[PDB]
Amino acid sequence: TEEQIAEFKEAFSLFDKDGDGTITTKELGTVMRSLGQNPTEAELQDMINEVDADGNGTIDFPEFLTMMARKMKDTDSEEEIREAFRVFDKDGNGYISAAELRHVMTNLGEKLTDEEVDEMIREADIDGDGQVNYEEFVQMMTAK
């Protein structure tokens, strides 16, 4: 962890286009739009509402470091993703077919690209059958 705690702060204040210790939530709506997102101001104010645990909106990484210091791979956020398959499960066992996973992948929430969702179920359907099991996916999401 000693080799990443220095150069990350170069990207932390990179959105403000200056040297100030600011996460720049007002300028994040221009930085992400320059990247090609262009969100609304309601979702933009919702970003640092839970990302920045301080509460101001622009920070010298109390929680911008803690956002990096949350690996999202241990057993505290591995069952919450495993519950997201359970909302789609019918008749138990994690039955989810490639057609049903493509049906739910390109339709709801924040949709993926077709070049992403076409190959997303590829490593989770190595047997080629009609059941993309959740345990074969969270094992791929174990390093996420």
Partner 1 sequence: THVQGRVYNFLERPTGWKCFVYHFAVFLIVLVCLIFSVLSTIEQYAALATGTLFWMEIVLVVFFGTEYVVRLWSAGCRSKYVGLWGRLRFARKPISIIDLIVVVASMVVLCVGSKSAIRGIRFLQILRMLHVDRQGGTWRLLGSVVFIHRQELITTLYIGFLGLIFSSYFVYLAEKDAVNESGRVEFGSYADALWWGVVTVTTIGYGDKVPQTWVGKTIASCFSVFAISFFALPAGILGSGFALKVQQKQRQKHFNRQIPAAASLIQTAWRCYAAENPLREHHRATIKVIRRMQYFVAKKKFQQARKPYDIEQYSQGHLNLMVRIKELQRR
52 is annotated as contributing to ligand binding: yes
Collapse the DSSP code of 124 into the 3-class scheme (helix H, G, I; strand E, B; otherwise coil) and give the result.
coil
Collapse the DSSP code of 140 into the 3-class scheme (helix H, G, I; strand E, B; otherwise coil) and give the result.
coil
Q: Which among a second copy, Ca ion, partner 1, none contacts residue 56 (Cβ within 5 to 8 A by kind)?
A: Ca ion
Close Cβ partners of 87 (under 8 Å, ≥ 6 residues apart): none
Cα angle, residue 9 at apex, residues 8 and 10 outer, rounded to 5°: 90
68 vs 95, which CB is nearer to partner 1?
A: 68
Minimal distance in Å, beta carbon 45 to Ca ion?
13
Answer for which of 34, 38, 49, 93 binds a second copy (CB under 8 A) is: 93
> Do 12 and 51 form a contact (C-beta atoms < 8 A)?
no
Phi (first) and psi of residue 102, to 5 degrees: -70, -30
Show contacts with Ca ion in window 36-55 (CB under 5 A). Answer: 52, 54
Q: Which residues are annotated as a binding site?
A: 16, 18, 20, 22, 27, 52, 54, 56, 58, 63, 89, 91, 93, 95, 100, 125, 127, 129, 131, 136
Residues that bind a second copy (CB under 8 A): 75-76, 79, 92-93, 95, 131
